[PDB]
PDB file of all heavy atoms in Angstrom:
ATOM      1  N   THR I  23     -28.392  -0.567  -3.756  1.00  0.00           N
ATOM      2  CA  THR I  23     -27.599  -1.734  -3.402  1.00  0.00           C
ATOM      3  C   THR I  23     -26.114  -1.397  -3.286  1.00  0.00           C
ATOM      4  O   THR I  23     -25.442  -1.850  -2.350  1.00  0.00           O
ATOM      5  CB  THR I  23     -27.825  -2.829  -4.437  1.00  0.00           C
ATOM      6  OG1 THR I  23     -29.233  -3.077  -4.548  1.00  0.00           O
ATOM      7  CG2 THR I  23     -27.128  -4.111  -4.021  1.00  0.00           C
ATOM      8  N   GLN I  24     -25.580  -0.611  -4.224  1.00  0.00           N
ATOM      9  CA  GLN I  24     -24.158  -0.271  -4.168  1.00  0.00           C
ATOM     10  C   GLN I  24     -23.841   0.566  -2.935  1.00  0.00           C
ATOM     11  O   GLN I  24     -22.895   0.270  -2.198  1.00  0.00           O
ATOM     12  CB  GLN I  24     -23.737   0.473  -5.434  1.00  0.00           C
ATOM     13  CG  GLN I  24     -23.261  -0.430  -6.531  1.00  0.00           C
ATOM     14  CD  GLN I  24     -22.291  -1.486  -6.019  1.00  0.00           C
ATOM     15  OE1 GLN I  24     -21.179  -1.174  -5.562  1.00  0.00           O
ATOM     16  NE2 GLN I  24     -22.708  -2.744  -6.088  1.00  0.00           N
ATOM     17  N   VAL I  25     -24.620   1.626  -2.703  1.00  0.00           N
ATOM     18  CA  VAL I  25     -24.385   2.499  -1.557  1.00  0.00           C
ATOM     19  C   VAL I  25     -24.405   1.695  -0.265  1.00  0.00           C
ATOM     20  O   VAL I  25     -23.478   1.777   0.553  1.00  0.00           O
ATOM     21  CB  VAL I  25     -25.422   3.638  -1.535  1.00  0.00           C
ATOM     22  CG1 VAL I  25     -25.480   4.299  -0.175  1.00  0.00           C
ATOM     23  CG2 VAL I  25     -25.098   4.655  -2.603  1.00  0.00           C
ATOM     24  N   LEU I  26     -25.459   0.893  -0.068  1.00  0.00           N
ATOM     25  CA  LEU I  26     -25.566   0.083   1.142  1.00  0.00           C
ATOM     26  C   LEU I  26     -24.429  -0.929   1.246  1.00  0.00           C
ATOM     27  O   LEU I  26     -23.893  -1.150   2.338  1.00  0.00           O
ATOM     28  CB  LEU I  26     -26.928  -0.619   1.191  1.00  0.00           C
ATOM     29  CG  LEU I  26     -28.068   0.384   1.399  1.00  0.00           C
ATOM     30  CD1 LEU I  26     -29.427  -0.290   1.386  1.00  0.00           C
ATOM     31  CD2 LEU I  26     -27.872   1.137   2.703  1.00  0.00           C
ATOM     32  N   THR I  27     -24.046  -1.554   0.129  1.00  0.00           N
ATOM     33  CA  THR I  27     -22.930  -2.497   0.163  1.00  0.00           C
ATOM     34  C   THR I  27     -21.656  -1.812   0.637  1.00  0.00           C
ATOM     35  O   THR I  27     -20.984  -2.294   1.551  1.00  0.00           O
ATOM     36  CB  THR I  27     -22.715  -3.118  -1.213  1.00  0.00           C
ATOM     37  OG1 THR I  27     -23.889  -3.842  -1.577  1.00  0.00           O
ATOM     38  CG2 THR I  27     -21.534  -4.083  -1.188  1.00  0.00           C
ATOM     39  N   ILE I  28     -21.333  -0.662   0.045  1.00  0.00           N
ATOM     40  CA  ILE I  28     -20.135   0.081   0.438  1.00  0.00           C
ATOM     41  C   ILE I  28     -20.166   0.406   1.928  1.00  0.00           C
ATOM     42  O   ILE I  28     -19.165   0.243   2.631  1.00  0.00           O
ATOM     43  CB  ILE I  28     -20.001   1.356  -0.420  1.00  0.00           C
ATOM     44  CG1 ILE I  28     -19.803   1.002  -1.898  1.00  0.00           C
ATOM     45  CG2 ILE I  28     -18.851   2.229   0.078  1.00  0.00           C
ATOM     46  CD1 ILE I  28     -19.843   2.209  -2.822  1.00  0.00           C
ATOM     47  N   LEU I  29     -21.316   0.851   2.436  1.00  0.00           N
ATOM     48  CA  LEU I  29     -21.372   1.357   3.806  1.00  0.00           C
ATOM     49  C   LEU I  29     -21.072   0.269   4.823  1.00  0.00           C
ATOM     50  O   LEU I  29     -20.309   0.482   5.771  1.00  0.00           O
ATOM     51  CB  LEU I  29     -22.736   1.982   4.079  1.00  0.00           C
ATOM     52  CG  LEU I  29     -22.881   3.353   3.411  1.00  0.00           C
ATOM     53  CD1 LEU I  29     -24.301   3.885   3.595  1.00  0.00           C
ATOM     54  CD2 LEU I  29     -21.837   4.320   3.983  1.00  0.00           C
ATOM     55  N   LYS I  30     -21.669  -0.905   4.658  1.00  0.00           N
ATOM     56  CA  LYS I  30     -21.465  -1.982   5.611  1.00  0.00           C
ATOM     57  C   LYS I  30     -20.428  -2.995   5.133  1.00  0.00           C
ATOM     58  O   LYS I  30     -20.490  -4.165   5.507  1.00  0.00           O
ATOM     59  CB  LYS I  30     -22.794  -2.663   5.935  1.00  0.00           C
ATOM     60  CG  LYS I  30     -23.695  -2.931   4.749  1.00  0.00           C
ATOM     61  CD  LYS I  30     -24.929  -3.705   5.188  1.00  0.00           C
ATOM     62  CE  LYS I  30     -25.886  -3.946   4.034  1.00  0.00           C
ATOM     63  NZ  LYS I  30     -26.840  -5.014   4.420  1.00  0.00           N
ATOM     64  N   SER I  31     -19.454  -2.565   4.326  1.00  0.00           N
ATOM     65  CA  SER I  31     -18.401  -3.467   3.882  1.00  0.00           C
ATOM     66  C   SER I  31     -17.003  -3.077   4.333  1.00  0.00           C
ATOM     67  O   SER I  31     -16.075  -3.877   4.160  1.00  0.00           O
ATOM     68  CB  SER I  31     -18.413  -3.601   2.354  1.00  0.00           C
ATOM     69  OG  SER I  31     -19.213  -4.713   1.970  1.00  0.00           O
ATOM     70  N   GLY I  32     -16.813  -1.899   4.918  1.00  0.00           N
ATOM     71  CA  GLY I  32     -15.508  -1.530   5.418  1.00  0.00           C
ATOM     72  C   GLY I  32     -15.608  -0.687   6.673  1.00  0.00           C
ATOM     73  O   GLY I  32     -16.701  -0.378   7.154  1.00  0.00           O
ATOM     74  N   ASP I  33     -14.435  -0.339   7.199  1.00  0.00           N
ATOM     75  CA  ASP I  33     -14.339   0.665   8.248  1.00  0.00           C
ATOM     76  C   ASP I  33     -15.044   1.943   7.812  1.00  0.00           C
ATOM     77  O   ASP I  33     -14.903   2.390   6.673  1.00  0.00           O
ATOM     78  CB  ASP I  33     -12.867   0.954   8.564  1.00  0.00           C
ATOM     79  CG  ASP I  33     -12.690   2.077   9.584  1.00  0.00           C
ATOM     80  OD1 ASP I  33     -13.671   2.425  10.283  1.00  0.00           O
ATOM     81  OD2 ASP I  33     -11.564   2.616   9.687  1.00  0.00           O
ATOM     82  N   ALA I  34     -15.798   2.531   8.741  1.00  0.00           N
ATOM     83  CA  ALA I  34     -16.603   3.705   8.418  1.00  0.00           C
ATOM     84  C   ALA I  34     -15.744   4.863   7.929  1.00  0.00           C
ATOM     85  O   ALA I  34     -16.148   5.608   7.030  1.00  0.00           O
ATOM     86  CB  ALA I  34     -17.408   4.130   9.642  1.00  0.00           C
ATOM     87  N   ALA I  35     -14.559   5.032   8.519  1.00  0.00           N
ATOM     88  CA  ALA I  35     -13.688   6.151   8.179  1.00  0.00           C
ATOM     89  C   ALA I  35     -13.351   6.185   6.697  1.00  0.00           C
ATOM     90  O   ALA I  35     -13.123   7.267   6.143  1.00  0.00           O
ATOM     91  CB  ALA I  35     -12.403   6.085   9.006  1.00  0.00           C
ATOM     92  N   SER I  36     -13.311   5.025   6.044  1.00  0.00           N
ATOM     93  CA  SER I  36     -13.118   4.986   4.603  1.00  0.00           C
ATOM     94  C   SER I  36     -14.383   4.614   3.848  1.00  0.00           C
ATOM     95  O   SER I  36     -14.528   5.008   2.685  1.00  0.00           O
ATOM     96  CB  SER I  36     -11.986   4.012   4.230  1.00  0.00           C
ATOM     97  OG  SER I  36     -12.131   2.755   4.873  1.00  0.00           O
ATOM     98  N   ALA I  37     -15.311   3.885   4.485  1.00  0.00           N
ATOM     99  CA  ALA I  37     -16.510   3.439   3.779  1.00  0.00           C
ATOM    100  C   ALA I  37     -17.477   4.591   3.511  1.00  0.00           C
ATOM    101  O   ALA I  37     -18.118   4.635   2.457  1.00  0.00           O
ATOM    102  CB  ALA I  37     -17.210   2.328   4.564  1.00  0.00           C
ATOM    103  N   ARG I  38     -17.629   5.509   4.462  1.00  0.00           N
ATOM    104  CA  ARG I  38     -18.490   6.669   4.230  1.00  0.00           C
ATOM    105  C   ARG I  38     -17.993   7.520   3.061  1.00  0.00           C
ATOM    106  O   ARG I  38     -18.779   7.771   2.130  1.00  0.00           O
ATOM    107  CB  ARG I  38     -18.612   7.462   5.541  1.00  0.00           C
ATOM    108  CG  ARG I  38     -19.865   8.305   5.719  1.00  0.00           C
ATOM    109  CD  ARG I  38     -19.918   8.879   7.138  1.00  0.00           C
ATOM    110  NE  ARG I  38     -18.655   9.528   7.477  1.00  0.00           N
ATOM    111  CZ  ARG I  38     -18.410  10.825   7.322  1.00  0.00           C
ATOM    112  NH1 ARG I  38     -19.352  11.665   6.906  1.00  0.00           N
ATOM    113  NH2 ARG I  38     -17.190  11.291   7.580  1.00  0.00           N
ATOM    114  N   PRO I  39     -16.730   7.958   3.010  1.00  0.00           N
ATOM    115  CA  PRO I  39     -16.268   8.667   1.795  1.00  0.00           C
ATOM    116  C   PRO I  39     -16.467   7.877   0.505  1.00  0.00           C
ATOM    117  O   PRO I  39     -16.845   8.465  -0.513  1.00  0.00           O
ATOM    118  CB  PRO I  39     -14.777   8.918   2.072  1.00  0.00           C
ATOM    119  CG  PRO I  39     -14.613   8.766   3.550  1.00  0.00           C
ATOM    120  CD  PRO I  39     -15.660   7.821   4.014  1.00  0.00           C
ATOM    121  N   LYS I  40     -16.222   6.560   0.502  1.00  0.00           N
ATOM    122  CA  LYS I  40     -16.438   5.798  -0.722  1.00  0.00           C
ATOM    123  C   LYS I  40     -17.908   5.824  -1.141  1.00  0.00           C
ATOM    124  O   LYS I  40     -18.221   5.947  -2.333  1.00  0.00           O
ATOM    125  CB  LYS I  40     -15.931   4.360  -0.551  1.00  0.00           C
ATOM    126  CG  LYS I  40     -14.410   4.268  -0.554  1.00  0.00           C
ATOM    127  CD  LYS I  40     -13.867   2.810  -0.743  1.00  0.00           C
ATOM    128  CE  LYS I  40     -13.767   2.057   0.549  1.00  0.00           C
ATOM    129  NZ  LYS I  40     -13.140   0.671   0.434  1.00  0.00           N
ATOM    130  N   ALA I  41     -18.830   5.738  -0.179  1.00  0.00           N
ATOM    131  CA  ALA I  41     -20.250   5.761  -0.533  1.00  0.00           C
ATOM    132  C   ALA I  41     -20.672   7.126  -1.074  1.00  0.00           C
ATOM    133  O   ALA I  41     -21.451   7.194  -2.033  1.00  0.00           O
ATOM    134  CB  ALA I  41     -21.116   5.374   0.672  1.00  0.00           C
ATOM    135  N   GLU I  42     -20.188   8.217  -0.458  1.00  0.00           N
ATOM    136  CA  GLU I  42     -20.464   9.562  -0.966  1.00  0.00           C
ATOM    137  C   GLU I  42     -19.991   9.715  -2.401  1.00  0.00           C
ATOM    138  O   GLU I  42     -20.709  10.254  -3.259  1.00  0.00           O
ATOM    139  CB  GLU I  42     -19.764  10.624  -0.112  1.00  0.00           C
ATOM    140  CG  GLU I  42     -20.254  10.848   1.299  1.00  0.00           C
ATOM    141  CD  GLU I  42     -19.278  11.725   2.095  1.00  0.00           C
ATOM    142  OE1 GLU I  42     -18.241  12.166   1.528  1.00  0.00           O
ATOM    143  OE2 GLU I  42     -19.518  11.952   3.297  1.00  0.00           O
ATOM    144  N   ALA I  43     -18.744   9.307  -2.660  1.00  0.00           N
ATOM    145  CA  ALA I  43     -18.156   9.503  -3.974  1.00  0.00           C
ATOM    146  C   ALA I  43     -18.852   8.642  -5.015  1.00  0.00           C
ATOM    147  O   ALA I  43     -19.025   9.069  -6.164  1.00  0.00           O
ATOM    148  CB  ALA I  43     -16.660   9.194  -3.925  1.00  0.00           C
ATOM    149  N   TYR I  44     -19.243   7.420  -4.649  1.00  0.00           N
ATOM    150  CA  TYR I  44     -20.020   6.612  -5.577  1.00  0.00           C
ATOM    151  C   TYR I  44     -21.332   7.307  -5.927  1.00  0.00           C
ATOM    152  O   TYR I  44     -21.719   7.371  -7.096  1.00  0.00           O
ATOM    153  CB  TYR I  44     -20.287   5.219  -4.992  1.00  0.00           C
ATOM    154  CG  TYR I  44     -21.373   4.510  -5.772  1.00  0.00           C
ATOM    155  CD1 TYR I  44     -21.074   3.796  -6.932  1.00  0.00           C
ATOM    156  CD2 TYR I  44     -22.711   4.603  -5.380  1.00  0.00           C
ATOM    157  CE1 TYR I  44     -22.079   3.177  -7.663  1.00  0.00           C
ATOM    158  CE2 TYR I  44     -23.720   3.998  -6.110  1.00  0.00           C
ATOM    159  CZ  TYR I  44     -23.398   3.287  -7.239  1.00  0.00           C
ATOM    160  OH  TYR I  44     -24.409   2.685  -7.942  1.00  0.00           O
ATOM    161  N   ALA I  45     -22.021   7.857  -4.923  1.00  0.00           N
ATOM    162  CA  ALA I  45     -23.348   8.420  -5.138  1.00  0.00           C
ATOM    163  C   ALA I  45     -23.314   9.771  -5.855  1.00  0.00           C
ATOM    164  O   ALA I  45     -24.239  10.071  -6.617  1.00  0.00           O
ATOM    165  CB  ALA I  45     -24.086   8.547  -3.800  1.00  0.00           C
ATOM    166  N   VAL I  46     -22.248  10.571  -5.670  1.00  0.00           N
ATOM    167  CA  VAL I  46     -22.243  11.952  -6.175  1.00  0.00           C
ATOM    168  C   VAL I  46     -22.612  12.052  -7.652  1.00  0.00           C
ATOM    169  O   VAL I  46     -23.491  12.863  -7.994  1.00  0.00           O
ATOM    170  CB  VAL I  46     -20.901  12.629  -5.855  1.00  0.00           C
ATOM    171  CG1 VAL I  46     -20.609  13.767  -6.849  1.00  0.00           C
ATOM    172  CG2 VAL I  46     -20.920  13.175  -4.446  1.00  0.00           C
ATOM    173  N   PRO I  47     -21.976  11.322  -8.576  1.00  0.00           N
ATOM    174  CA  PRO I  47     -22.276  11.549  -9.995  1.00  0.00           C
ATOM    175  C   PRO I  47     -23.672  11.108 -10.391  1.00  0.00           C
ATOM    176  O   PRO I  47     -24.122  11.466 -11.488  1.00  0.00           O
ATOM    177  CB  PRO I  47     -21.191  10.744 -10.729  1.00  0.00           C
ATOM    178  CG  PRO I  47     -20.709   9.759  -9.756  1.00  0.00           C
ATOM    179  CD  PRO I  47     -20.886  10.344  -8.390  1.00  0.00           C
ATOM    180  N   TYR I  48     -24.378  10.361  -9.540  1.00  0.00           N
ATOM    181  CA  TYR I  48     -25.765  10.032  -9.829  1.00  0.00           C
ATOM    182  C   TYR I  48     -26.738  11.137  -9.432  1.00  0.00           C
ATOM    183  O   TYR I  48     -27.929  11.027  -9.743  1.00  0.00           O
ATOM    184  CB  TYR I  48     -26.154   8.707  -9.150  1.00  0.00           C
ATOM    185  CG  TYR I  48     -25.541   7.525  -9.859  1.00  0.00           C
ATOM    186  CD1 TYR I  48     -24.419   6.882  -9.346  1.00  0.00           C
ATOM    187  CD2 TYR I  48     -26.065   7.078 -11.067  1.00  0.00           C
ATOM    188  CE1 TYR I  48     -23.839   5.802 -10.012  1.00  0.00           C
ATOM    189  CE2 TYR I  48     -25.496   6.014 -11.747  1.00  0.00           C
ATOM    190  CZ  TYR I  48     -24.384   5.377 -11.218  1.00  0.00           C
ATOM    191  OH  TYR I  48     -23.831   4.321 -11.909  1.00  0.00           O
ATOM    192  N   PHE I  49     -26.280  12.181  -8.749  1.00  0.00           N
ATOM    193  CA  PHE I  49     -27.108  13.354  -8.506  1.00  0.00           C
ATOM    194  C   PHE I  49     -26.723  14.475  -9.461  1.00  0.00           C
ATOM    195  O   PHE I  49     -25.545  14.651  -9.791  1.00  0.00           O
ATOM    196  CB  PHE I  49     -26.967  13.860  -7.073  1.00  0.00           C
ATOM    197  CG  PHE I  49     -27.519  12.936  -6.071  1.00  0.00           C
ATOM    198  CD1 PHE I  49     -26.692  12.062  -5.393  1.00  0.00           C
ATOM    199  CD2 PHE I  49     -28.885  12.903  -5.826  1.00  0.00           C
ATOM    200  CE1 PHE I  49     -27.215  11.192  -4.471  1.00  0.00           C
ATOM    201  CE2 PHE I  49     -29.408  12.038  -4.905  1.00  0.00           C
ATOM    202  CZ  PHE I  49     -28.581  11.184  -4.229  1.00  0.00           C
ATOM    203  N   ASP I  50     -27.724  15.231  -9.898  1.00  0.00           N
ATOM    204  CA  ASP I  50     -27.503  16.461 -10.649  1.00  0.00           C
ATOM    205  C   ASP I  50     -27.655  17.603  -9.652  1.00  0.00           C
ATOM    206  O   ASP I  50     -28.761  18.089  -9.392  1.00  0.00           O
ATOM    207  CB  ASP I  50     -28.474  16.573 -11.814  1.00  0.00           C
ATOM    208  CG  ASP I  50     -28.218  17.798 -12.676  1.00  0.00           C
ATOM    209  OD1 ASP I  50     -27.606  18.772 -12.190  1.00  0.00           O
ATOM    210  OD2 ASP I  50     -28.641  17.786 -13.842  1.00  0.00           O
ATOM    211  N   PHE I  51     -26.521  18.046  -9.106  1.00  0.00           N
ATOM    212  CA  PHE I  51     -26.553  19.083  -8.085  1.00  0.00           C
ATOM    213  C   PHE I  51     -26.866  20.459  -8.656  1.00  0.00           C
ATOM    214  O   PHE I  51     -27.306  21.335  -7.903  1.00  0.00           O
ATOM    215  CB  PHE I  51     -25.229  19.115  -7.304  1.00  0.00           C
ATOM    216  CG  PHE I  51     -25.080  17.961  -6.375  1.00  0.00           C
ATOM    217  CD1 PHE I  51     -24.285  16.880  -6.717  1.00  0.00           C
ATOM    218  CD2 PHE I  51     -25.776  17.932  -5.178  1.00  0.00           C
ATOM    219  CE1 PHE I  51     -24.182  15.790  -5.874  1.00  0.00           C
ATOM    220  CE2 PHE I  51     -25.691  16.858  -4.340  1.00  0.00           C
ATOM    221  CZ  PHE I  51     -24.886  15.781  -4.677  1.00  0.00           C
ATOM    222  N   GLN I  52     -26.670  20.678  -9.954  1.00  0.00           N
ATOM    223  CA  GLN I  52     -27.100  21.959 -10.509  1.00  0.00           C
ATOM    224  C   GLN I  52     -28.621  22.060 -10.487  1.00  0.00           C
ATOM    225  O   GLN I  52     -29.180  23.063 -10.022  1.00  0.00           O
ATOM    226  CB  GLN I  52     -26.557  22.160 -11.926  1.00  0.00           C
ATOM    227  CG  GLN I  52     -25.031  22.039 -12.046  1.00  0.00           C
ATOM    228  CD  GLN I  52     -24.289  23.360 -11.827  1.00  0.00           C
ATOM    229  OE1 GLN I  52     -24.873  24.452 -11.923  1.00  0.00           O
ATOM    230  NE2 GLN I  52     -22.986  23.263 -11.542  1.00  0.00           N
ATOM    231  N   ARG I  53     -29.312  21.017 -10.955  1.00  0.00           N
ATOM    232  CA  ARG I  53     -30.770  21.070 -10.970  1.00  0.00           C
ATOM    233  C   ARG I  53     -31.337  21.049  -9.557  1.00  0.00           C
ATOM    234  O   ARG I  53     -32.318  21.741  -9.265  1.00  0.00           O
ATOM    235  CB  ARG I  53     -31.328  19.913 -11.784  1.00  0.00           C
ATOM    236  CG  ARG I  53     -31.510  20.260 -13.232  1.00  0.00           C
ATOM    237  CD  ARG I  53     -32.128  19.103 -13.987  1.00  0.00           C
ATOM    238  NE  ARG I  53     -32.259  19.393 -15.408  1.00  0.00           N
ATOM    239  CZ  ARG I  53     -31.237  19.440 -16.253  1.00  0.00           C
ATOM    240  NH1 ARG I  53     -29.992  19.245 -15.845  1.00  0.00           N
ATOM    241  NH2 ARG I  53     -31.468  19.701 -17.535  1.00  0.00           N
ATOM    242  N   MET I  54     -30.724  20.256  -8.677  1.00  0.00           N
ATOM    243  CA  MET I  54     -31.101  20.207  -7.270  1.00  0.00           C
ATOM    244  C   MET I  54     -30.938  21.574  -6.588  1.00  0.00           C
ATOM    245  O   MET I  54     -31.813  22.010  -5.827  1.00  0.00           O
ATOM    246  CB  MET I  54     -30.250  19.130  -6.600  1.00  0.00           C
ATOM    247  CG  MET I  54     -30.555  18.744  -5.204  1.00  0.00           C
ATOM    248  SD  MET I  54     -29.678  17.178  -4.818  1.00  0.00           S
ATOM    249  CE  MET I  54     -30.898  15.993  -5.329  1.00  0.00           C
ATOM    250  N   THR I  55     -29.824  22.263  -6.846  1.00  0.00           N
ATOM    251  CA  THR I  55     -29.632  23.608  -6.301  1.00  0.00           C
ATOM    252  C   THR I  55     -30.659  24.593  -6.857  1.00  0.00           C
ATOM    253  O   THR I  55     -31.162  25.460  -6.129  1.00  0.00           O
ATOM    254  CB  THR I  55     -28.210  24.086  -6.597  1.00  0.00           C
ATOM    255  OG1 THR I  55     -27.284  23.153  -6.028  1.00  0.00           O
ATOM    256  CG2 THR I  55     -27.962  25.438  -5.987  1.00  0.00           C
ATOM    257  N   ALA I  56     -30.998  24.467  -8.141  1.00  0.00           N
ATOM    258  CA  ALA I  56     -32.039  25.317  -8.705  1.00  0.00           C
ATOM    259  C   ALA I  56     -33.356  25.138  -7.959  1.00  0.00           C
ATOM    260  O   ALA I  56     -34.074  26.116  -7.700  1.00  0.00           O
ATOM    261  CB  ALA I  56     -32.215  25.019 -10.198  1.00  0.00           C
TER     262      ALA I  56
END
């Protein structure tokens, strides 16, 4: 819900970076890279 809200709530040029940054800490990229 948060990711989708961010994406369709602003200009893409700023909304896409905001959605990425919101989502990043919810992934464990160390385990994913493993």
Side-chain angles (χ1 to χ4, degrees):
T23 306
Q24 270 314 295
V25 163
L26 292 177
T27 298
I28 297 173
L29 285 175
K30 43 176 178 164
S31 267
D33 176 17
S36 49
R38 206 173 50 94
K40 287 195 274 185
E42 291 168 1
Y44 165 85
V46 155
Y48 286 102
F49 293 98
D50 184 338
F51 287 101
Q52 305 271 341
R53 270 183 183 73
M54 188 166 271
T55 302

